[PDB]
Amino acid sequence: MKLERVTVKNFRSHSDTVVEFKEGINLIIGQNGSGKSSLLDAILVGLYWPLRIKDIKKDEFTKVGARDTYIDLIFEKDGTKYRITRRFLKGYSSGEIHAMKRLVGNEWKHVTEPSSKAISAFMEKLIPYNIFLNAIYIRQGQIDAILESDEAREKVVREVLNLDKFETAYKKLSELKKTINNRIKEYRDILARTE
Amino acid sequence: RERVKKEIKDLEKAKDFTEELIEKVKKYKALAREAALSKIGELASEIFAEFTEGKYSEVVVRAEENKVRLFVVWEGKERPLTFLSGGERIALGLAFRLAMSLYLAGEISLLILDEPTPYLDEERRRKLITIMERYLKKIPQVILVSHDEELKDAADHVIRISLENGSSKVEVVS
């Protein structure tokens, strides 16, 4: 895949931030708390909204602000160049506008009902949410989380390698069995006193 | 009591499948992870091979109850991560991480690295500036995000941002 241009407006620090990405290695240099990390999160949210990202409160976009929060992203996958536009009007207005056009020729044509549900789906086709956020986005301190202990890894691996799901599936069916045994025990002690 | 007698049987049968089904989930979960890590290592080893220039032949990733251990095979003898040099360490660490990405995606065309360097180190920083130019530039597009000016000369395009008067500003450089 390849990111060409992020555009954030009124999300945390960024009021009207604009970046032109390029081939090779793009180093983004900035003192701490200078928005960089934010920018990454705008991209990320821009691409997968409304799915969850890191631990970013949905409201972070929706309500904070007097003007509009805006996220424009342009990228390219498999020769095709797609573009997302996430706008959030606030206040009495309170509104969202979503649209992901593809670039055919020189005009931008939609590529799915200009709704939010739609686009999200269309995204799950072009580049699944579980592959980007956890193969492409090497999140911070993950490396190190492997260069320290062994369960810090089972932790990382469990997230990244996507092994969470399974376990909880087992955690519920398991809770379902316990909830059975108890029931038995009850129906037992009742049949005791009674009969 | 009639009714109370049967609910006990029904309960009992159900206990049998809710229990034998859990077991399978336990089986699969296992396997999913067993393989996954095997193939991850097969990669991690190689990715690590070019990060050290053959110095280290194979990386070993083996899973255990709530814990996945890494070993670097040196002089045939398996060995602990603490056996490696500060650099070789960030190396293996990275080599491992990418290995996963490569497993989960199969191909690595894009790669967003959200700050890997620990407060402008020199030992690590060096190895990264190395890993950077002899391997990573290889990738189509990598977006490295760090506050270690140093890295500024190995990356193709430096785009400096800075919190100037509340709003953030983007100043290009190359």
Swiss-Prot record, chain B:
Domain note: Binding of ATP induces a closed, compact conformation of the Rad50/Mre11 complex. ATP hydrolysis opens the complex.
Superkingdom, taxonomy of origin: Archaea
Subunit description: Homodimer. Forms a heterotetramer composed of two Mre11 subunits and two Rad50 subunits. Homodimerization is promoted by ATP binding.
Residues reported in the UniProt entry to bind ATP: K55, Y56, F83, L84, S85, G86, G87, E88
Role, per record: Part of the Rad50/Mre11 complex, which is involved in the early steps of DNA double-strand break (DSB) repair. The complex may facilitate opening of the processed DNA ends to aid in the recruitment of HerA and NurA. Rad50 controls the balance between DNA end bridging and DNA resection via ATP-dependent structural rearrangements of the Rad50/Mre11 complex. The ATP-bound conformation promotes DNA end binding and end tethering, and alters Mre11 nuclease activity. ATP hydrolysis promotes both Mre11 activity as well as HerA/NurA activity. Also has reversible adenylate kinase activity.
Outcome of swapping L94W: Destabilizes the ATP-dimerized state. Promotes HerA/NurA activity
Family: Belongs to the SMC family. RAD50 subfamily.
Gene name per UniProt: rad50
Organism: Pyrococcus furiosus (strain ATCC 43587 / DSM 3638 / JCM 8422 / Vc1)
Name of the featured protein: DNA double-strand break repair Rad50 ATPase
Included stretch of the parent chain: 709 to 882 of 882
